[PDB]
């Protein structure tokens with residue numbers, strides 16, 4: 468069973484499907500309207516047929532259903548009907564920051580600062596629940612028509628959670644196992660501070676329209692990160708960005724996770740604590756988009 472609180476009913480009983488927004492491996496996403504309230508929602512639809520593995524989708528719903536924070540996309544339930552699973556969430560009309568910057572070009576430093584503050588608020592909340600997003604990037608940061616910011620797409624987090632559960636189930640007898648082996652099996656080998664690194668990369672992505680080393684073979688990038696002399700990336704254009712932005716990048720991209728600042732600590736950084744960071748900055752961006 469995918470989730471103990473699934474609605475075993477047709478989502479079209481409650482929603483009018485307005486537009487297919489896209490589709491791919493993850494399934495399809497629709498813009499729909501609540502037939503009673505008139506509110507807009509996003510519906511993510513995925514095939515869910517007998518003997519399919521439910522574990523990843525199970526974990527994705529578990530994450531969404533236990534979040535109640537402005538900067539995490541709101542969850543309105545899931546429907547299982549005729550072997551299709553529909554996950555219902557708050558609608559963000561502008562899509563992702565990647566959808567946006569592919570049209571607008573690079574964001575301003577103030578726009579990036581506001582985005583980073585809102586993402587850090589969401590991350591601090593997730594981490595206080597002992598959740599890890601694990602896929603912070605422009606494509607997974609959504610913007611609604613009011614210029615508000617919501618973290619979404621917990622698919623990678625759910626995949627990891629499901630793999631972690633499978634490796635507990637088949638770990639075997641533990642009595643000869645080294646503690647570090649047990650720790651990797653139960654906890655994964657890293658912690659929530661990976662999200663802070665990913666936010667730093669995302670800030671560069673919003674500034675430059677690509678993450679660092681985007682044109683290097685992915686396996687080479689992985690290898691380079693494991694060398695003892697690996698150097699964190701930087702913003703390319705030194706004069707375009709303030710010292711505060713360069714420092715935000717420096718500290719979020721701290722190589723050692725033992726020394727990398729937490730989300731709460733980062734919320735005190737000059738870049739995201741400065742005045743004038745509000746949704747008007749992103750409404751400006753959406754006006755440029757149109």
Ligand SMILES: CC(C)n1ncc2cnc(Nc3cc([C@@H]4CCNC4)nc(N4CCC(F)(F)C4)n3)cc21
Nearest residue numbers: 488489490496509511556557558559560561562619
């Ligand atoms: C991550 C996804 C399942 N998700 N989760 C919650 C959520 C809330 N709102 C949206 N909103 C939007 C808006 C737009 C706008 C149309 C025109 N420009 C962007 N596109 C899209 N997507 C095109 C590609 C897709 F995967 F189908 C989605 N989603 C998507 C949402």
